[PDB]
Amino acid sequence: NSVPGAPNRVSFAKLREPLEVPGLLDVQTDSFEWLIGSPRWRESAAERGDVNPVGGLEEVLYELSPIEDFSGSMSLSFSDPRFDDVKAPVDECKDKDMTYAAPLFVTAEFINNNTGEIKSQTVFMGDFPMMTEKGTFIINGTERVVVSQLVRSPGVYFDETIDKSTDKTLHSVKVIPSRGAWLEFDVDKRDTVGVRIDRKRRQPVTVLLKALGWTSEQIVERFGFSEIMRSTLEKDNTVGTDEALLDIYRKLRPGEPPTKESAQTLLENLFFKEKRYDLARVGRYKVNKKLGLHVGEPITSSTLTEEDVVATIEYLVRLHEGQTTMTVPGGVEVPVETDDIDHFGNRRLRTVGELIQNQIRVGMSRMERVVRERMTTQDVEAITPQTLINIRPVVAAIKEFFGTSQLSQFMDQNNPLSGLTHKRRLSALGPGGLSRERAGLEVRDVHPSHYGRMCPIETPEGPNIGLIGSLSVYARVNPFGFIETPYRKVVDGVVSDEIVYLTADEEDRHVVAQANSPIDADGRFVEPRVLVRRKAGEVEYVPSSEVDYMDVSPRQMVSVATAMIPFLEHDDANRALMGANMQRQAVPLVRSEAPLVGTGMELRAAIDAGDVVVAEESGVIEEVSADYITVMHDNGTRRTYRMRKFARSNHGTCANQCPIVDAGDRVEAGQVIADGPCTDDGEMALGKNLLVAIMPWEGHNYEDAIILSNRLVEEDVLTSIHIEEHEIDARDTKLGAEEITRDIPNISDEVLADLDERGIVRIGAEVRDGDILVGKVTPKGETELTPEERLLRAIFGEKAREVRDTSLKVPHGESGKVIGIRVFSREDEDELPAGVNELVRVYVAQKRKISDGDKLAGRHGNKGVIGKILPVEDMPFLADGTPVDIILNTHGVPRRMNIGQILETHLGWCAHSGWKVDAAKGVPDWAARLPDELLEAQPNAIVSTPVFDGAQEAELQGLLSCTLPNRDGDVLVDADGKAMLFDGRSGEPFPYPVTVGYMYIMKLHHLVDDKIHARSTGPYSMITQQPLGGKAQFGGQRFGEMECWAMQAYGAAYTLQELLTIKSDDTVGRVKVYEAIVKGENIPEPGIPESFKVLLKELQSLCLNVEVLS
Amino acid sequence: GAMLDVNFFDELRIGLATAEDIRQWSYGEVKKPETINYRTLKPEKDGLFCEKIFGPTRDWECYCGKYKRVRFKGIICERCGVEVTRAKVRRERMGHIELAAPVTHIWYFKGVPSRLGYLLDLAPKDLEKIIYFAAYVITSVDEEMRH
Amino acid sequence: EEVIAEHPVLLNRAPTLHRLGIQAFEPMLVEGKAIQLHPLVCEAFNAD
Amino acid sequence: WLSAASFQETTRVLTDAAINCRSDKLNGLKENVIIGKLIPAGTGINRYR
Amino acid sequence: GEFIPRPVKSSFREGLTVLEYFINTHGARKGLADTALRTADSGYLTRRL
Amino acid sequence: ALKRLKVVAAFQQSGNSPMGMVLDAVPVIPPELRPMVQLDGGRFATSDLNDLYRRVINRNNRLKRLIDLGAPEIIVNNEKRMLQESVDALFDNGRRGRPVTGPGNRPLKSLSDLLKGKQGRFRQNLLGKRVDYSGRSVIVVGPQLKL
DNA sequence: AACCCTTTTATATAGTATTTTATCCTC
DNA sequence: GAGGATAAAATACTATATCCTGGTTAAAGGGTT
RNA sequence: CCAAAAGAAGUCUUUCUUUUGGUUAACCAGGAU
Ligand SMILES: [Mg+2]
Ligand SMILES: [Zn+2]
């Protein structure tokens, strides 16, 4: 609606949306440009948090400096991080295997505290990787993505449990810091508030309380209101700061010398010092908020203070007593309650910037350690900042982050939606998070605080279910990492347009209504009773006077992938989850087609995915070609956009781009100027519209199978292009001189026909499995000083000619044209990894059609492999002779509760034939609220039904009742939506009408060509002589432990013996059985498997005398 | 009983292995932390891949190459010491390392219940102190001379 | 086609929960790359 | 001890068997499968074999 | 596990509202996670038996 | 006493002696079961047991040299302790103390780890195997077939 | 200026089994 | 008041279905040749 | 057990003789039923 050039897609939406969807990649870009401190982020923070704008690098450096020795006679400080221009643009970085990064310079200043001689320098701090405009990093040529992590916020967490013996409540607290020790108070069977400092052992709270310097009289003066505390104090045991300190010291130190002052050195070092204990800003904020401590003042320091600990103890005791509100001196009163660790006010988000910040922090920590170790050894009055700065740890940390982390993953580039969804992912598992095989069912559930902040539908189906989710459409992240949502605030029953962003707690306090509520054109609800959400997520009917807020719209709780399923409210959650997860597996097809019935989210997702070319500035087109577009801006300047033609993606698909503008058209800023892999004029198009019938047919569409027409193969409707990449390199080696050449030993000429004058195959030459792509030979080694031979090489001049052809061969089960050859070389001063002289890369392309066993799917979780592909003549055809394209089985629809597809089918037909509502004498009742411009549509019209505000059943029925004829005065589909089909195979009409329509089906990336495999004999493993595994080598199918029980149950002993002896690892039985088969003899008897002898040797290697008797 | 096994099989007895049995299995001693020479791609001598200890790396060939034919069999080269035979013997011949000081077996010490402790009636803590050189132990005391 | 006549072949689908997860069938050549399974054994294999 | 070692707790089973010097008679279905013999069930028993 | 007293009052033919769909997702995900854990446990139990 | 009598009677009834718990020689598995293979570019792929054997042999040779050369008892005890730890890491890595890690800060596989777990010898290689004359593929519906 | 050696706190529970240790009972 | 006996807690070890594919496999310092 | 080279015979392309050469693992991640 706002894009300059967009297709006109009419919508059934009734409501109006006050807020336009934000930038879908804002999370990544706005969390990175904070790390570097760009001017754009500074401006954004100015209109919000101008009090203290400081980037991540500034924070790390100013937490690091000053670096001083023990004597305090010299200091080193850092300041003013600075970035230069990127070394090379994105395309060159991706082409030449160059990481995309920019130089980093900082100002290192050294000051001598006994001479006043200052030495300032600009020190180079390494090459810092930079984020592209699409939210991806480019590391070693590959495009990687850093995932956001859901972690538990640091702070104080109270909780309650029940004891088996006492049968009474037991309360506990825990102060979990960021990079610090833990102190856990609690209350057990006999009333004894007990600390567990640093998870060592229980003690009375009085010991710690006194160690801080509190008199027993003071202890009973303040905490003298709980029987628990009075009992603990009156029976504590010891008294005196030194005595309690010594007790704590014994508890902490493992029988170390009981030095009194060491007690302080530990007590203050572990908690109150600002080097080993940190709460960060989020931790301090949460602690202050929970305990109602100093609020007016802002953050000034983050380290535990005695006031916080004593307030925590008071909070715990009062919670155990039964009170419901507390006030601490010098602070506001706060309610007394337990805390839930699954609440979204307690689960914060570490984004791409805050994750890089931690690695830079550890790198700077190692640099500081090296600096303060080198400070003393290097002579004084000879020290300059350049000398002490060891940069290797920092670059090592930055380099090991983006190669060996579970939060930095290869971008999923199956299609634009795959990448777009990958960038907006929140993973609960990773370094610092839970594990996939250790998490219970209480963390995989959907908390009622996720509404609008994380989609409840989209999530993995396997064992990751609940641990990985996707950020909702309108959600953002505030500075502390807590996700927010926009709400439209209602004042005195008047629904204003003041959008306010709230987090989980604020939403908890207030009452929130629904977006799809009867607004009466003046911001006033029609009826007083409207569904609302109360504090704990309870749903109730409240009179329309207590409501505080409303949702900005429906479609606020769903993510990008789930917002593209039409008629979502008619599908069950189980099927909607599958339908959403299967839209990111669809393969890009050669020719794309946008759906007839969508949801209006396709355009925005396509534009924000970044797979299209958008006119940067308005102008007029000068030249258009399949390779480039030239745009003449209004003021002289001309800009040329290049196209990605047949480029491979991370998952082996095609990445075509084609212009959609003419040589005379005038473009406008923000307009789409070139399509992408899965786009049709700027809108996402993952599949095709097919004419579908819903009948069972001869049992070929039995048990989730599908039947297709042969037309879809003849017309290349579902054809796709796949590209494979092969690499080989030349390396020095100690022997030296690895060469790429045609001269290969033991190779004839018929197998060297395609190779060109210097090895590599020719472009356009079709290859088969086993062929050679790059000829390469390496030294045979085995340098042997044979008298006659060696004396000839030395003086006579005989050459070595020791070669071993380690050529590049196309692996098993591959073929296709060679479309691209990219050859590097050390001669042309190309940048290669050390010790590599040459690098050759060959691309092989295949064009795959749809075939039996290929996996298809719709948008409603209706998957299924292709059972059969019938010829065009023997398919059910309409009265006018039109065959149907696909047949789906009836029995799967009503049982799985995804009736939405049927609705889509119906609407598809009305979108295909076109309709015209006859408002001759008043518009019909059912079309009373149907937006004008929908009272008539032309054939092949494109409509849209937003996810939770769309076409009603009455409107669908009405539209079905009035629809245009095809060519003559024939209406093929009646008012019920069903048409009379003819049996194309026997000729007789089917006795009853069938449901026909148009459905949008996609082609999943689970093709049979990659699944089929067979083996008779082949490679065998080395340690144990069992066959290999996998299709690439050859390998055999595993005959596991569970398949052996079935054979034993059958009683088949000989089959099991032959399977486990002469088919897997009887080294002589294999050859003997092969010879017996080829010679027609009887199969011989098995021997002993080799793995048993390997086991005996392994047991003997453990000093166990395993012997076999007789 | 059967050594390499021809598949007539009565029992599979297991037991502890004494140093004498360990030296009986071994065909030689490994006394050098060398694996392969990366200039001729041939195993080092007295290393973890020594051809004299574990056998030839190629069918019917010795280290010095004085013998390369099938006619030579079961004869140990007097120069290199490698026995001329098939290469599969490299899957069957074991070595041994002669420790300069005794060492305990972890299975019988760390594993719960500590079976060295039950045999000697020592708690795991003190036993761990003794074997890792953190405390002394009185291995004998003479009562006749005592009083 | 002369060789495979009356030569059984064992078909198996994992997980093999029970005995009838492995069954012997007489093979017959077909066009395509997918194995064709009789509809009445799907309950035994538990194979949709 | 072979079947027990292959079921669970390989280390504990192996160490206690070594201490006890246990001898295995190879009479179970699992042991015969491990050592590559004909299981004593169904078609592998003497009556039919 | 306790019932929501609301309750959901629309059939999937008419189409649920936003809140009803949200409160349905609870049971949906509970069932899926239960299924996964159940298949794992059944495999282990059969192995022991 | 009941717990102790188990091991005591175990060592009493049989002719074996408990002395097998304390080692004097360490056996070395044949090379073919811990192979190192050539990856193109002059690279080698070790078996992860060569590292542990080299760690044992280095300490053993160092201790032997320090004993023959003569040295104070403290250094000899330290070397013997490190040899004990090296042998323990060889037989069962990580059971006591910090696991010995190779490149990438990943623990090494000891001899015990070859037999324990779902990926151990017993369960993975002896009870189940990969076999010849096998294929796999996607299944479709065959309504025209006989049962 | 290039080899050889060396070395580098948490989202889990559930079940059982053995060693402290801490306190209570008995003489 | 001292010693033995029994609860308690405190740690130590074991286990958690099947199958497939794709990306990596060290650097830094000291001593020596 | 395969590949390359040379020699002989015949067939118009197979056989015989001699020489040379001639397979991995472990982790992490992502999917499927
Ligand atoms: Mg299935
Ligand atoms: Zn020799």
mmCIF file of N, CA and C in Angstrom, chain A residues 441 444-448 451 456-457 459 465 514 516 531 533 539 541 557 568-574 576-577 897 899 948 953 1041 1045, chain E residues 4 6 9 11-34 36-37 43 46-48:
data_model
loop_
_atom_site.group_PDB
_atom_site.id
_atom_site.type_symbol
_atom_site.label_atom_id
_atom_site.label_comp_id
_atom_site.label_asym_id
_atom_site.label_seq_id
_atom_site.Cartn_x
_atom_site.Cartn_y
_atom_site.Cartn_z
ATOM 1 N N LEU A 441 9.651 -30.155 30.560
ATOM 2 C CA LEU A 441 8.440 -29.695 29.899
ATOM 3 C C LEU A 441 7.930 -28.364 30.433
ATOM 4 N N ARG A 444 9.443 -25.680 27.863
ATOM 5 C CA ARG A 444 8.988 -25.789 26.486
ATOM 6 C C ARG A 444 7.566 -25.285 26.294
ATOM 7 N N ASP A 445 6.869 -24.925 27.366
ATOM 8 C CA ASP A 445 5.488 -24.493 27.250
ATOM 9 C C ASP A 445 5.412 -23.041 26.787
ATOM 10 N N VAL A 446 4.192 -22.613 26.470
ATOM 11 C CA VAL A 446 3.937 -21.259 25.990
ATOM 12 C C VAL A 446 3.349 -20.438 27.128
ATOM 13 N N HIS A 447 4.172 -19.584 27.727
ATOM 14 C CA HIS A 447 3.732 -18.769 28.844
ATOM 15 C C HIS A 447 2.744 -17.705 28.361
ATOM 16 N N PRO A 448 1.773 -17.323 29.195
ATOM 17 C CA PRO A 448 0.848 -16.253 28.792
ATOM 18 C C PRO A 448 1.487 -14.877 28.703
ATOM 19 N N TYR A 451 2.387 -13.227 24.589
ATOM 20 C CA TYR A 451 1.440 -12.638 23.654
ATOM 21 C C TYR A 451 2.008 -11.362 23.056
ATOM 22 N N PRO A 456 3.511 -18.222 19.239
ATOM 23 C CA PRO A 456 3.288 -19.528 19.868
ATOM 24 C C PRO A 456 3.188 -20.684 18.889
ATOM 25 N N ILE A 457 3.016 -20.415 17.595
ATOM 26 C CA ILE A 457 2.840 -21.465 16.598
ATOM 27 C C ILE A 457 4.197 -21.927 16.089
ATOM 28 N N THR A 459 7.687 -23.093 15.602
ATOM 29 C CA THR A 459 8.701 -23.711 16.442
ATOM 30 C C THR A 459 9.058 -25.061 15.834
ATOM 31 N N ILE A 465 11.508 -28.668 20.091
ATOM 32 C CA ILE A 465 10.228 -27.979 20.214
ATOM 33 C C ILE A 465 10.201 -27.194 21.513
ATOM 34 N N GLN A 514 -8.927 -6.420 23.078
ATOM 35 C CA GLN A 514 -8.594 -7.064 21.817
ATOM 36 C C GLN A 514 -8.659 -6.065 20.670
ATOM 37 N N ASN A 516 -9.662 -6.799 17.487
ATOM 38 C CA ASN A 516 -10.910 -7.019 16.759
ATOM 39 C C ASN A 516 -12.106 -6.833 17.693
ATOM 40 N N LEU A 531 -13.875 -8.886 25.877
ATOM 41 C CA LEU A 531 -12.836 -9.772 26.381
ATOM 42 C C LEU A 531 -11.548 -8.997 26.621
ATOM 43 N N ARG A 533 -7.504 -9.199 29.008
ATOM 44 C CA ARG A 533 -6.486 -10.036 29.638
ATOM 45 C C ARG A 533 -6.098 -9.401 30.966
ATOM 46 N N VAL A 539 -8.408 -14.451 31.187
ATOM 47 C CA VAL A 539 -9.300 -13.838 30.209
ATOM 48 C C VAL A 539 -10.673 -13.674 30.845
ATOM 49 N N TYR A 541 -14.530 -10.905 30.934
ATOM 50 C CA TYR A 541 -15.376 -9.865 30.348
ATOM 51 C C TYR A 541 -15.396 -8.700 31.330
ATOM 52 N N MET A 557 0.285 -11.233 17.399
ATOM 53 C CA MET A 557 0.868 -12.358 18.114
ATOM 54 C C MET A 557 1.588 -13.339 17.202
ATOM 55 N N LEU A 568 -6.048 -18.732 8.887
ATOM 56 C CA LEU A 568 -5.322 -19.390 9.966
ATOM 57 C C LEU A 568 -6.234 -19.729 11.133
ATOM 58 N N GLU A 569 -7.258 -18.918 11.379
ATOM 59 C CA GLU A 569 -8.153 -19.163 12.499
ATOM 60 C C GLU A 569 -9.041 -20.380 12.290
ATOM 61 N N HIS A 570 -9.033 -20.978 11.103
ATOM 62 C CA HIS A 570 -9.779 -22.200 10.840
ATOM 63 C C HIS A 570 -8.906 -23.448 10.888
ATOM 64 N N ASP A 571 -7.624 -23.319 11.222
ATOM 65 C CA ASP A 571 -6.705 -24.444 11.315
ATOM 66 C C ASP A 571 -6.317 -24.681 12.766
ATOM 67 N N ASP A 572 -6.136 -25.947 13.126
ATOM 68 C CA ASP A 572 -5.638 -26.279 14.450
ATOM 69 C C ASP A 572 -4.168 -25.897 14.567
ATOM 70 N N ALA A 573 -3.707 -25.734 15.808
ATOM 71 C CA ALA A 573 -2.333 -25.296 16.030
ATOM 72 C C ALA A 573 -1.322 -26.318 15.533
ATOM 73 N N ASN A 574 -1.623 -27.611 15.664
ATOM 74 C CA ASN A 574 -0.679 -28.632 15.226
ATOM 75 C C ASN A 574 -0.408 -28.523 13.734
ATOM 76 N N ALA A 576 -1.125 -25.771 11.781
ATOM 77 C CA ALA A 576 -0.563 -24.462 11.473
ATOM 78 C C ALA A 576 0.936 -24.433 11.723
ATOM 79 N N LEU A 577 1.398 -25.090 12.786
ATOM 80 C CA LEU A 577 2.831 -25.162 13.050
ATOM 81 C C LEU A 577 3.566 -25.822 11.891
ATOM 82 N N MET A 897 -8.227 -31.469 11.163
ATOM 83 C CA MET A 897 -8.736 -30.183 11.629
ATOM 84 C C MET A 897 -7.981 -29.021 10.990
ATOM 85 N N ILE A 899 -9.441 -27.463 8.082
ATOM 86 C CA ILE A 899 -10.482 -27.192 7.098
ATOM 87 C C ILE A 899 -10.162 -25.914 6.336
ATOM 88 N N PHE A 948 -5.982 -12.881 10.767
ATOM 89 C CA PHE A 948 -7.096 -12.949 11.706
ATOM 90 C C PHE A 948 -8.203 -11.943 11.417
ATOM 91 N N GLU A 953 -17.570 -16.781 6.239
ATOM 92 C CA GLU A 953 -18.212 -17.882 5.532
ATOM 93 C C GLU A 953 -19.390 -17.388 4.703
ATOM 94 N N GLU A 1041 20.555 -52.894 16.132
ATOM 95 C CA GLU A 1041 20.232 -53.788 17.232
ATOM 96 C C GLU A 1041 18.755 -54.133 17.293
ATOM 97 N N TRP A 1045 16.501 -58.176 16.851
ATOM 98 C CA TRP A 1045 15.474 -58.795 17.679
ATOM 99 C C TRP A 1045 14.330 -59.336 16.835
ATOM 100 N N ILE E 4 -9.351 -23.895 31.641
ATOM 101 C CA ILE E 4 -9.661 -22.469 31.591
ATOM 102 C C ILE E 4 -11.179 -22.346 31.679
ATOM 103 N N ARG E 6 -13.239 -20.259 30.628
ATOM 104 C CA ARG E 6 -13.740 -19.154 29.821
ATOM 105 C C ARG E 6 -15.109 -19.474 29.219
ATOM 106 N N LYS E 9 -15.531 -20.798 22.619
ATOM 107 C CA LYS E 9 -16.939 -20.878 22.265
ATOM 108 C C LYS E 9 -17.194 -20.894 20.766
ATOM 109 N N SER E 11 -16.377 -22.700 16.850
ATOM 110 C CA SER E 11 -15.905 -23.861 16.116
ATOM 111 C C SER E 11 -14.933 -23.432 15.024
ATOM 112 N N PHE E 12 -14.131 -24.386 14.555
ATOM 113 C CA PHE E 12 -13.149 -24.063 13.530
ATOM 114 C C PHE E 12 -13.784 -23.757 12.185
ATOM 115 N N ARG E 13 -15.085 -23.995 12.021
ATOM 116 C CA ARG E 13 -15.763 -23.521 10.822
ATOM 117 C C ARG E 13 -15.951 -22.011 10.864
ATOM 118 N N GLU E 14 -16.396 -21.479 12.005
ATOM 119 C CA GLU E 14 -16.573 -20.037 12.132
ATOM 120 C C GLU E 14 -15.239 -19.318 12.249
ATOM 121 N N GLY E 15 -14.253 -19.948 12.877
ATOM 122 C CA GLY E 15 -12.963 -19.326 13.075
ATOM 123 C C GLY E 15 -12.819 -18.732 14.457
ATOM 124 N N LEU E 16 -11.795 -19.167 15.181
ATOM 125 C CA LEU E 16 -11.543 -18.669 16.522
ATOM 126 C C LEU E 16 -11.008 -17.246 16.481
ATOM 127 N N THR E 17 -11.212 -16.521 17.573
ATOM 128 C CA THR E 17 -10.635 -15.197 17.716
ATOM 129 C C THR E 17 -9.173 -15.325 18.137
ATOM 130 N N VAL E 18 -8.546 -14.193 18.460
ATOM 131 C CA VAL E 18 -7.120 -14.204 18.775
ATOM 132 C C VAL E 18 -6.872 -14.870 20.126
ATOM 133 N N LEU E 19 -7.660 -14.501 21.139
ATOM 134 C CA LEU E 19 -7.455 -15.053 22.474
ATOM 135 C C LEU E 19 -7.728 -16.548 22.510
ATOM 136 N N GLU E 20 -8.779 -16.998 21.827
ATOM 137 C CA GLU E 20 -9.096 -18.420 21.836
ATOM 138 C C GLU E 20 -7.977 -19.232 21.196
ATOM 139 N N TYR E 21 -7.452 -18.758 20.068
ATOM 140 C CA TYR E 21 -6.323 -19.432 19.439
ATOM 141 C C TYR E 21 -5.120 -19.460 20.373
ATOM 142 N N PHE E 22 -4.853 -18.340 21.045
ATOM 143 C CA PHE E 22 -3.704 -18.283 21.937
ATOM 144 C C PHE E 22 -3.839 -19.293 23.068
ATOM 145 N N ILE E 23 -5.038 -19.431 23.633
ATOM 146 C CA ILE E 23 -5.216 -20.314 24.782
ATOM 147 C C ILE E 23 -5.312 -21.768 24.330
ATOM 148 N N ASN E 24 -5.548 -21.995 23.040
ATOM 149 C CA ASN E 24 -5.460 -23.335 22.464
ATOM 150 C C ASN E 24 -4.022 -23.801 22.237
ATOM 151 N N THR E 25 -3.135 -22.869 21.884
ATOM 152 C CA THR E 25 -1.740 -23.235 21.648
ATOM 153 C C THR E 25 -1.117 -23.932 22.855
ATOM 154 N N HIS E 26 -1.571 -23.605 24.068
ATOM 155 C CA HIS E 26 -1.051 -24.256 25.269
ATOM 156 C C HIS E 26 -1.141 -25.773 25.149
ATOM 157 N N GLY E 27 -2.368 -26.285 25.037
ATOM 158 C CA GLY E 27 -2.559 -27.718 24.915
ATOM 159 C C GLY E 27 -1.866 -28.292 23.698
ATOM 160 N N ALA E 28 -1.886 -27.555 22.582
ATOM 161 C CA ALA E 28 -1.221 -28.072 21.386
ATOM 162 C C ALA E 28 0.246 -28.401 21.668
ATOM 163 N N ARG E 29 0.987 -27.435 22.215
ATOM 164 C CA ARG E 29 2.413 -27.657 22.436
ATOM 165 C C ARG E 29 2.649 -28.701 23.519
ATOM 166 N N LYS E 30 1.793 -28.727 24.544
ATOM 167 C CA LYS E 30 1.919 -29.761 25.564
ATOM 168 C C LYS E 30 1.862 -31.144 24.929
ATOM 169 N N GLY E 31 0.882 -31.355 24.049
ATOM 170 C CA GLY E 31 0.761 -32.642 23.384
ATOM 171 C C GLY E 31 1.982 -32.997 22.562
ATOM 172 N N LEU E 32 2.502 -32.032 21.798
ATOM 173 C CA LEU E 32 3.668 -32.337 20.964
ATOM 174 C C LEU E 32 4.876 -32.754 21.809
ATOM 175 N N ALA E 33 5.177 -31.987 22.858
ATOM 176 C CA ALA E 33 6.330 -32.324 23.690
ATOM 177 C C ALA E 33 6.144 -33.683 24.356
ATOM 178 N N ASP E 34 4.925 -33.960 24.828
ATOM 179 C CA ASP E 34 4.639 -35.265 25.407
ATOM 180 C C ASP E 34 4.930 -36.374 24.407
ATOM 181 N N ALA E 36 7.059 -36.469 21.906
ATOM 182 C CA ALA E 36 8.495 -36.702 21.729
ATOM 183 C C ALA E 36 9.082 -37.487 22.905
ATOM 184 N N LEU E 37 8.845 -37.001 24.128
ATOM 185 C CA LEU E 37 9.395 -37.699 25.286
ATOM 186 C C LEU E 37 8.898 -39.139 25.335
ATOM 187 N N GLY E 43 11.156 -46.484 23.492
ATOM 188 C CA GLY E 43 12.315 -47.181 22.956
ATOM 189 C C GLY E 43 13.203 -47.747 24.050
ATOM 190 N N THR E 46 11.538 -50.799 25.844
ATOM 191 C CA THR E 46 11.587 -52.013 25.038
ATOM 192 C C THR E 46 12.984 -52.610 25.049
ATOM 193 N N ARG E 47 14.012 -51.758 24.985
ATOM 194 C CA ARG E 47 15.375 -52.279 25.012
ATOM 195 C C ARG E 47 15.649 -53.050 26.294
ATOM 196 N N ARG E 48 15.237 -52.509 27.441
ATOM 197 C CA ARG E 48 15.458 -53.233 28.694
ATOM 198 C C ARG E 48 14.655 -54.527 28.757
#
